């Protein structure tokens, strides 16, 4: 029996694919509709345009990757995109013909289906899993059993010890919810990632957490405000109405995502409240139908300033894996956001994440019947860490500490505070937060979404990963 933990695009597509490959599969997820997949409102990258190509897509990916992208993985994912999309469509899913554009991409290559592509993909995959007879169980993974560096079983909250496992596919997503300001659901605390770590699984790139510059949460509904708004005339000001951005970068509202994130971050740290003003955008309703709808249902006049905030959005790292999704632990796969295939390097390229999940999931059957290859750490430095203690922190405290001391702008003093706070804890949320801070402190430079005011430049000597391994 093959077990898949997580019911997002990664876990679901793998489940359907494995089932079709004749495998007996069981899906287990703490919240069937949890994770980031259901609420993704953008699209899936694929160089299928007449003016595009896998190589160009690869070049764009490598660029934002800022030197940390695993070139082999990038080439594999971009070269697979077309046939994976085609396979997915043969299953009965149809993307729209119009390819959208996203910042960072040289050509239009983003596939969409309605204004809620993630939701559509989710429901579709869930419908197929049901028709394939795949059991979908709502339970929570809490432990993984390993012998001689191989998976033998695992434990769930509700059913306890599971001993009949030939393969365990972890598709539990990232830990962006471990930040006071997050764009995802509360399920994303990275416990799946921590549990794997406790079973001897190797983690990497924990310090490369990606933040989104302009997010809002009217009535509690999170909504990413596209950078295209600023391109059409959107303004950003504090509670006083001044366009502070100009004081950090001359490009103002037109500066890179990370730039605004840093400017906004500092401003808020002073206690200022930030807003975005869309009243000067011409033909707003025609240009931004989805934004208009979001604002309409919350009874917020798009002519009035909107409270915004930067937020933890996507984590580049996690369980290191090769192109197949194999971690260092035999029979333990990691796919989707919980894994670190090296596709994203120091900064994920928009739309490459749903693509990543779909590729590793749909392509998984191609490798399940082969001998295990595993991973190589020759592209980085392995750090062995021992977790021991009984200090316990609330989720709210952890999220505030990460936001302030392991956030958009970092430095040694703050990182050390975070390190010392989590040092004596064995809580999953604490461990993940600990490794992120530890790695951020070790990486004495600024690269991709990792920015240190005390080391503002990129160190060519750091063009390598920071791997973590648990020891007694
Ligand atoms: C608001 C938002 C919009 C986004 N939009 C896009 C986009 O437009 N295009 C793009 O490419 N990327 C986008 N991203 C990322 C993207 O949506 C992908 O879904 C994501 O990167 C990962 O998908 P996944 O299957 O790996 O995990 P998820 O979809 O996050 O999977 C998490 C699953 O694992 C389960 N789980 C977690 N822990 C446990 C546990 N311990 N036991 C059992 N189950 C567990 C969860 O309940 C959930 O079902 C967006 C992210 C956000 C937050
Ligand atoms: Cl995206």
The DSSP secondary structure of 267-313, one letter per residue, reads HHHHT--EEEE-TT-TTHHHH-HHHHHHHHHTT--TTS-EE-EEEEE
Residue nearest atom 4 in ligand 1 by C-alpha distance: 40
| Closest approach atom of ligand 1 to CA 36 | 30
Q: Whole-angstrom Cα distance, residue 268 to residue 247?
A: 14
Q: What does residue 411 show for φ and ψ, rounded to 5 degrees?
A: -165, 165
Q: Domain check: are 11 and 117 in the same one?
A: yes
Supply the CATH number for residue 404's domain.
Answer: 1.20.58.100
Annotated binding site for FAD: 7-10, 29, 36-37, 42-43, 191, 337, 353-354
Q: Whole-angstrom Cα distance, residue 463 to residue 458?
A: 9
Q: Domain check: are 299 and 325 in the same one?
A: no
Q: Domain check: are 256 and 371 in the same one?
A: no
Q: Domain check: are 301 and 338 in the same one?
A: no
Q: Domain check: are 5 and 124 in the same one?
A: yes
- Kind of pairing between the strands at 167-170 and 380-385: unpaired
The domain in which residue 399 lies consists of 376-472
- 60 in helix, strand or coil? helix
Query: What does this entry list as its resolution, in Å?
Result: 2.1
Supply the CATH number for residue 3's domain.
Answer: 3.50.50.60
Sign of the torsion formed by the C-alpha atoms of 289, 290, 296 and 302: negative
Question: What one-character-per-residue DSSP string does 108-128 give?
Answer: --EE-SSS-HHHHHHHHHHHH
Q: Whole-angstrom Cα distance, residue 140 to residue 357?
A: 20
With contact defined as beta carbons under 8 Å apart, do 152 and 165 qualify? Answer: yes
Q: Domain check: are 413 and 443 in the same one?
A: yes
Which residue out of 173, 316, 319, 364 has the highest number of ligand 1 atoms within 8 Å of its CB and is therefore the one to mutate? 173
Tell me the β-bridge partners of 385: 470
Q: Domain check: are 331 and 384 in the same one?
A: no
Determine the distance separating the centroid of ligand 1 and the alpha carbon of 273, expressed in angstroms.
Answer: 29
- 464 in helix, strand or coil? coil
Q: How many residues are recorded in the chain?
A: 472
Q: Domain check: are 155 and 119 in the same one?
A: yes
Question: What one-character-per-residue DSSP string does 164-220 give?
Answer: --SEEEE-----GGGSSSBSS-TT-S-HHHHHHHHTT--EE-TT-EEEEEEEE-GGG
Half-sphere exposure of 74 (CA within 13 A, CB side): 25
Q: Whole-angstrom Cα distance, residue 214 to residue 155?
A: 39
Q: Which of 109, 230, 257, 399 is catalytic?
A: 257
With contact defined as beta carbons under 8 Å apart, do 190 and 429 qualify? Answer: yes
Q: Whole-angstrom Cα distance, residue 9 to residue 359?
A: 10
257 annotated active-site: yes
Q: Domain check: are 350 and 393 in the same one?
A: no
* Closest-approaching ligand to the CA atom of 40: 1
Query: Cβ–Cβ contacts within 10 Å for residue 198, how many?
Result: 15
Annotated binding site: 7-10, 29, 36-37, 42-43, 191, 337, 353-354
Determine the distance separating the centroid of ligand 1 and the alpha carbon of 251, expressed in angstroms.
Answer: 32
Which residue out of 8, 139, 142 has the highest number of ligand 1 atoms within 8 Å of its CB and is therefore the one to mutate? 8
E-assigned strands of 374-464? 380-385
Q: 321, 351, 375 — which closes off a domain?
A: 375
Determine the distance separating the centroid of ligand 1 and the alpha carbon of 334, expressed in angstroms.
Answer: 13
| Closest approach atom of ligand 1 to CA 41 | 8
Distances (CA, A) of 148 to 154, 192, 328, 329, 451: 15, 21, 12, 9, 39
Supply the CATH number for residue 252's domain.
Answer: 3.90.700.10
Q: Which two tokens stand for residue 463?
A: 């063009």
Determine the distance separating the centroid of ligand 2 and the alpha carbon of 438, expressed in angstroms.
Answer: 27
Determine the distance separating the centroid of ligand 1 and the alpha carbon of 97, expressed in angstroms.
Answer: 25
Q: Which two tokens stand for residue 402?
A: 């990460």
Half-sphere exposure of 361 (CA within 13 A, CB side): 30
Q: 375, 403, 422 — which closes off a domain?
A: 375
Residues near ligand 1 (Cβ within 6 A) = 5-11, 28-31, 34-37, 39-40, 42-44, 118, 140-141, 171-173, 183-184, 187-188, 191-192, 224, 313-314, 336-337, 351-355, 357
Q: Whole-angstrom Cα distance, residue 55 to residue 78?
A: 7
Q: Whole-angstrom Cα distance, residue 147 to residue 47?
A: 42
Considering its fold, how many domains does the chain have in total? 3
Q: Domain check: are 433 and 294 in the same one?
A: no
Query: Cβ–Cβ contacts within 10 Å for residue 142, how many?
Result: 16
Q: Domain check: are 342 and 435 in the same one?
A: no
Residue 104 region, left (φ>0) first, then alpha (ψ -120 to 50), else beta?
A: left
With contact defined as beta carbons under 8 Å apart, do 205 and 316 qualify? Answer: yes
Question: What one-character-per-residue DSSP string does 28-89 give?
Answer: E-SSTT-SSGGG--S-EE---STT--HHHHHHHHHHHHTT-S-HHHHHHHHHHHHHHHHHHH
Per the entry, the structure determination technique was: X-ray
Which residue out of 118, 294, 335, 359 has the highest number of ligand 1 atoms within 8 Å of its CB and is therefore the one to mutate? 118
Q: Domain check: are 386 and 340 in the same one?
A: no
Q: What does residue 106 show for φ and ψ, rounded to 5 degrees?
A: -75, -25
Query: Helix 71-90 and helix 54-65: axis angle, to 10°?
Result: 130
């Amino acid at each position: 029996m093959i077990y898949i933990i997580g019911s997002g695009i990664a876990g679901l597509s793998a489940g359907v694919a494995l089932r079709r490959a004749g495998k007996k599969v069981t899906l287990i997820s703490k919240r069937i509709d949890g994770g980031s997949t259901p609420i993704a409102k953008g699209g899936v990258a694929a160089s299928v345009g007449s003016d595009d190509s896998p190589e160009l897509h690869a070049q764009d990916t490598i660029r934002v990757g800022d030197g940390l992208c695993d070139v082999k993985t990038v080439n594999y994912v971009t070269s697979e995109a077309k046939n994976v999309i085609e396979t997915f469509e043969s299953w009965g899913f149809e993307f729209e013909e119009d390819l959208r554009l996203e910042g960072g991409h040289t050509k239009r290559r983003v596939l969409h289906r309605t204004d809620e592509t993630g939701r559509e993909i989710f429901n579709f995959l869930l419908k197929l899993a049901r028709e394939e007879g795949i059991p979908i169980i709502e339970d929570r993974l809490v432990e993984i059993r390993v012998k001689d560096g191989k998976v033998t079983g695992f434990v769930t909250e509700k059913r306890g010890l599971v001993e009949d496992v030939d393969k365990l596919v972890l598709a539990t997503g990232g830990y962006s919810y471990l930040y006071e300001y997050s764009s995802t659901q509360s399920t994303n605390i990275g416990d799946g990632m921590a549990i794997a770590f406790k079973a001897g699984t190797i983690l990497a790139d924990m310090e490369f957490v990606q933040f989104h510059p302009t997010v809002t949460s009217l009535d509690g509904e999170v909504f990413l405000l596209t950078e295209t708004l600023r391109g059409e005339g959107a303004q950003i000001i504090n509670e006083n109405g001044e366009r502070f951005l100009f004081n950090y970068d001359k490009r103002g509202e037109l500066a890179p995502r990370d730039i605004l994130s840093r400017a906004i971050y500092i401003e808020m740290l002073k206690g200022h409240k930030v807003f975005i003003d869309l009243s000067k955008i011409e033909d707003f309703e025609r240009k931004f139908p989805v934004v208009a709808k979001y604002l309409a249902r919350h009874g917020h006049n798009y002519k009035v300033k909107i409270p915004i905030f930067p937020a933890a959005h996507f984590v580049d790292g996690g369980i290191r894996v090769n192109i197949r999704g194999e971690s260092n632990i035999v029979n333990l796969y990691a796919i989707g956001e919980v894994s670190d295939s090296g596709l994203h390097g120091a900064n994920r390229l928009a739309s490459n994440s749903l693509l990543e999940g779909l590729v590793f999931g749909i392509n998984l059957p191609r490798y399940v019947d082969s001998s295990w290859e595993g991973i190589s750490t020759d592209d980085g430095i392995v750090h062995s860490v021992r977790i021991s203690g009984n200090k316990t922190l609330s989720l709210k405290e952890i999220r505030r500490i990460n936001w302030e001391n392991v956030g958009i702008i970092r430095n040694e003093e703050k990182l050390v505070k975070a390190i010392n706070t989590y040092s004596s804890s064995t809580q999953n949320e604490a461990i993940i937060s600990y490794l992120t801070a530890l790695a951020a402190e070790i990486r004495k430079e600024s690269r991709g979404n990792h920015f240190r005011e005390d080391y503002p430049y990129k160190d060519p000597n750091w063009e390598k990963r920071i791997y973590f391994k648990l020891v007694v």
